């Protein structure tokens, strides 16, 4: 019973993005107000909490192409 | 029972980004107010908390291409 | 039972980013106010907390391409 | 023609206010945003302008009784 | 023609205010944003302008009673 | 023509304010942002301008009673 696995992917890809000019981006928030009123937290595993986070972002890349992959062979 | 694994991926890829000019980005937040009122925290594992984080970001890269990958062979 | 593993990935990739000029980035926050009111913390493992962090960032790289990878062979 | 004026008002008044206790007043605005876009102003007399005034007030007096009066004899 | 004026007001008044206790007043604004964009101003007389005034007030007097009066005899 | 003026006001008044205790006043603004963009000002008389004044006040007197008066006899 010669188990045999020849796992062999190939990949010849491209993720291009040609752009002319990024200009005149304004972003002027106006404050606000948050108020959490809790008692206890008991986080236990892989928790990713964000309690009462008033914030702003301006993510303006000239690129932004993401090519995520994943492989796995859970042999038993 | 000669178990055999020939795990062998290939990758010939490209993630390019041609851009002209990044200009005139303004980002003028206006404050705000946060207020958390908790009692106890009992974080226990891999916790990633952000309690009451008033903040701002301006992430303006000339690139930004991300190529994440992952492999695994959990043999038993 | 001559177990055999020939784990052998290849990688011929590129993550390029051609840009013209990064210019005229302004970032003028306006303060704010935070107030946490807790009693006890009992962090225990791999905790990554940020309690009441009022802050700002201006991350403006001429690059920014990230190529993360990971491999693993948990043989038993 | 002995013109005669015997202008003579009297006033025996009271403006009282008995109160027990002023307590637990909260006032938590949430920001906002204004934007005026004008060209010219040409104010000329007794003008009382307030252009684009984002503001807040908390006027909590233990009194507040106002007794305004006015007299006049424009004789000719 | 013996013109005669006997202008003679009297005033026996009171503006009282009895109060118990002023307590627990909170006032927590949350910022905001204003933007005026004008060209010329040409104020000329008794002008009282307030252009783009973002502000806050907390006027909490234990009194506050105002008794304004005015008299005049513009004889000709 | 013996013009005669017997201008003679009287005033027996009181503006009292009895209070118990002023306590626990909080006032926690949260910033903001103003921006005026003008070219010329040409103020000429008795002008009282306040251009772009971001500010705060906490006027907490134990009194505050104001008794303003005015008299005038513009004889001709």
Curated annotation (Swiss-Prot), chains A, B, C, D, E, F:
PTM (free text): Phosphorylation at serine and threonine residues in S-P or T-P motifs by proline-directed protein kinases (PDPK1, CDK1, CDK5, GSK3, MAPK) (only 2-3 sites per protein in interphase, seven-fold increase in mitosis, and in the form associated with paired helical filaments (PHF-tau)), and at serine residues in K-X-G-S motifs by MAP/microtubule affinity-regulating kinase (MARK1, MARK2, MARK3 or MARK4), causing detachment from microtubules, and their disassembly. Phosphorylation decreases with age. Polyubiquitinated. Requires functional TRAF6 and may provoke SQSTM1-dependent degradation by the proteasome. PHF-tau can be modified by three different forms of polyubiquitination. 'Lys-48'-linked polyubiquitination is the major form, 'Lys-6'-linked and 'Lys-11'-linked polyubiquitination also occur.
Q: What is the effect of changing residue 34 to M?
A: In FTD1; ultrastructural and biochemical characteristics indistinguishable from Alzheimer disease; accelerates aggregation of tau into filaments
Residues the record marks as carrying a glycan: 44, 50, 66
Which residues are listed under the site Not glycated? 8, 14, 18, 28, 37, 40, 67, 72
Implicated disorder:
In Alzheimer disease, the neuronal cytoskeleton in the brain is progressively disrupted and replaced by tangles of paired helical filaments (PHF) and straight filaments, mainly composed of hyperphosphorylated forms of TAU (PHF-TAU or AD P-TAU). O-GlcNAcylation is greatly reduced in Alzheimer disease brain cerebral cortex leading to an increase in TAU/MAPT phosphorylations. Frontotemporal dementia 1: A form of dementia characterized by pathologic finding of frontotemporal lobar degeneration, presenile dementia with behavioral changes, deterioration of cognitive capacities and loss of memory. In some cases, parkinsonian symptoms are prominent. Neuropathological changes include frontotemporal atrophy often associated with atrophy of the basal ganglia, substantia nigra, amygdala. In most cases, protein tau deposits are found in glial cells and/or neurons.
Question: Crosslink Glycyl lysine isopeptide (Lys-Gly) (interchain with G-Cter in ubiquitin) sits at which residues?
Answer: 8, 14, 18, 28, 40, 44, 50, 66, 72
Q: Where are the Tau/MAP repeats?
A: 3-33, 34-65
- Residue positions, PTM N6,N6-dimethyllysine: 8
Q: Source species, please?
A: Homo sapiens (Human)
Location of the protein in the cell: Cytoplasm, Cytosol; Cell membrane; Cytoplasm, Cytoskeleton; Cell projection, Axon
* Quaternary data: Interacts with MARK1, MARK2, MARK3 and MARK4. Interacts with PSMC2 through SQSTM1. Interacts with SQSTM1 when polyubiquitinated. Interacts with FKBP4. Binds to CSNK1D. Interacts with SGK1. Interacts with PIN1. Interacts with LRRK2. Interacts with LRP1, leading to endocytosis; this interaction is reduced in the presence of LRPAP1/RAP.
**Chain positions with Omega-N-methylarginine modification:** 46
Domain comment as written in the entry: The tau/MAP repeat binds to tubulin. Type I isoforms contain 3 repeats while type II isoforms contain 4 repeats.
Residues with PTM Phosphoserine: 2, 21, 49, 53
Name-wise, this protein is Microtubule-associated protein tau
Write down which residues bear the modification named N6-acetyllysine. Answer: 8, 14, 18, 28, 40, 44, 66
Q: What does this protein do?
A: Promotes microtubule assembly and stability, and might be involved in the establishment and maintenance of neuronal polarity. The C-terminus binds axonal microtubules while the N-terminus binds neural plasma membrane components, suggesting that tau functions as a linker protein between both. Axonal polarity is predetermined by TAU/MAPT localization (in the neuronal cell) in the domain of the cell body defined by the centrosome. The short isoforms allow plasticity of the cytoskeleton whereas the longer isoforms may preferentially play a role in its stabilization.
Expression tissues: Expressed in neurons. Isoform PNS-tau is expressed in the peripheral nervous system while the others are expressed in the central nervous system.
């Amino acid at each position: 019973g010669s188990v045999q696995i020849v796992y062999k992917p190939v990949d010849l890809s491209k993720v291009t993005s040609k752009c002319g000019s990024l200009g005149n981006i304004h972003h002027k928030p106006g404050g606000g107000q948050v108020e959490v009123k809790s008692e206890k937290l008991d986080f236990k595993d892989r928790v990713q909490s964000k309690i009462g986070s008033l914030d702003n972002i301006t993510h303006v890349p000239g690129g932004g192409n993401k090519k995520i992959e994943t492989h796995k062979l859970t042999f038993r």
